[PDB]
Design a protein around this nucleic acid. Sequence first.
DNA 1: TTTTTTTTTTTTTTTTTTTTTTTTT
Lengths: 108, 122, 433
Amino acid sequence: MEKPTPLINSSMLGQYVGQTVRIVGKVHKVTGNTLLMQTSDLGNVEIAMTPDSDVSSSTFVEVTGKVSDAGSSFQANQIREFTTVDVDLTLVENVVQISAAFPNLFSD
Amino acid sequence: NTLRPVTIRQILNAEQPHPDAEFILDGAELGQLTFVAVVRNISRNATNVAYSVEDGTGQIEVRQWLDASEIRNNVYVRVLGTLKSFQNRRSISSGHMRPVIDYNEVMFHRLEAVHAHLQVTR
Amino acid sequence: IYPIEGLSPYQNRWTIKARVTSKSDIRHWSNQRGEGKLFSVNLLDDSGEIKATGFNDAVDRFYPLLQENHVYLISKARVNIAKKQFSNLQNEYEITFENSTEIEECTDATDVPEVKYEFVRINELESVEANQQCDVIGILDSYGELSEIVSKASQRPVQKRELTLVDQGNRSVKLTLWGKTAETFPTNAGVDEKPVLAFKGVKVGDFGGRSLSMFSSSTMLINPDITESHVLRGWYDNDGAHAQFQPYTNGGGAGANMAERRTIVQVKDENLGMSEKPDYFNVRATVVYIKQENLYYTACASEGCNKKVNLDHENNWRCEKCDRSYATPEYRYILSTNVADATGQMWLSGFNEDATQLIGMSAGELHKLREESESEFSAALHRAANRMYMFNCRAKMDTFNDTARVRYTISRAAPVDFAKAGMELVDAIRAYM
DNA sequence: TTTTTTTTTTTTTTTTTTTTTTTTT
Ligand SMILES: [Zn+2]
């Protein structure tokens, strides 16, 4: 059936507790299996990362996850790489907002 | 005779006014179409290659025809195809499939999708 | 007394106290159900901006009364959802004047902010990117004759006039005037005595390096009592009509751009190139097919000659031009490609430069790749399709033995910059929101 | 309730309109 997976920034977390979301960030710090992300929202999100994750040595990232019951933390389902070792985060913020404005194209 | 940026959720919502006729999306013929999604499953057959494909809006099958090992599970892909429904099942026939340039294109595409839709609609 | 900002349809009793910052012409229209007249106007207060529009009977009652840069009290109008395609302002709402709408002029303008000009020095205009607003001041050097033309898109005869504007930078720049303002221009007093002219919201065009045009919301003022026009006034009369100037360039389309971004439907729907004069445009399109047969031809290995070469009696390659034979024919692209977008599909031709980047390969390297196998040759071509490009193109007519055809020719083809392309669209979608 | 943003300017290069994924799930 595949539920649409919303593309979100840091402040949409609340609306999707328990759900699978999709989220794009600049990676800040990697403490063991925890990742610190910069949102397009300019807010920050905490992501509980899969054992097999070499995310550290990468810049922008796209996490498909589960919002967890707290308000702002995250189980990683899958993770996509971007940058280099120049994603436009302002564009992303806008794609987030416009996708939110058009459920008929981006959802049920 | 057009090439419409679409989301997968658009694809599934498109109408086929019964018989076996051409699908419509927004009161407009839906011929050749394009989109960006991630590769989730890959099955290979002697004839074709069917990829299981999702863009956050839904998932669809796309099979291309043998007569591209670069592409891999969990990698973004540009798709250029045509909507076929065999026996209620909906799928895209891709002559063209490519790994996405930079992530920014993923973004770009969603917008190209909204904008095209807006212009057929108003 | 509400601030502009606090206006909603949720609130019926209200009065704003705003200064008109721009006024429309009276625009008529003829169609199927209706026929009449509208006019609009842009308001300013401390709190913000809002457009306001009068239809038919409010044009009579209010067009005369509301003049630009004066501060009015407005009361008992309707607040509607903004039609953002027909406006510059970011406001969610606008105002429509009804048959109860009260308007009186306040002789109290001191609460109400004044239109702050952000002037650009003429010699700095090249730092501002095309299709963008701008406020500009300067001495009118001279002005051109009234030109009336039919445009190829509207198909509605345009009155037009050009002006030359100069300042301290010693750079001169063309500025186009449209419509009534064009015609009644010399009716404006002190217009031959080298007036200083002040422009708000002017479009920056790249025809002639940089150039200027007006919009419905634009504003020129003749000889304003603003310090700046006085500085210029003091500058010009003392050493200006003395020294010589710089014309920018790199007849007239002043304020015009040198190839508008059109959809494929537009290029055809406007009959671009169907005429003597080549038209230029920009298309964002995807390469759907490349024509295999006759993709390349053998060329003069000579310098700066690409005249086709042919195999004589001695199995050599002769150019008719430079009058010589070679053992090696220079491969060059006579590309024929089919590009699509959401509005339609269209054929482009490209030569050696652009086609090479379209197939990421010189023609020779492609030729060498075809001598090995057709599988690795069609493969290269297939793999060229399904890529998006910004296309700089020209549309011109061809005499193929008395018969005519339109050929669209790619002058430059860059690959789409998604970050930027994206942003642009962000702006366009916001318009329907 | 009701309607829009205008103009303009050039290579040297083959022939003259082209076939996009073709068939199983
Ligand atoms: Zn020669």
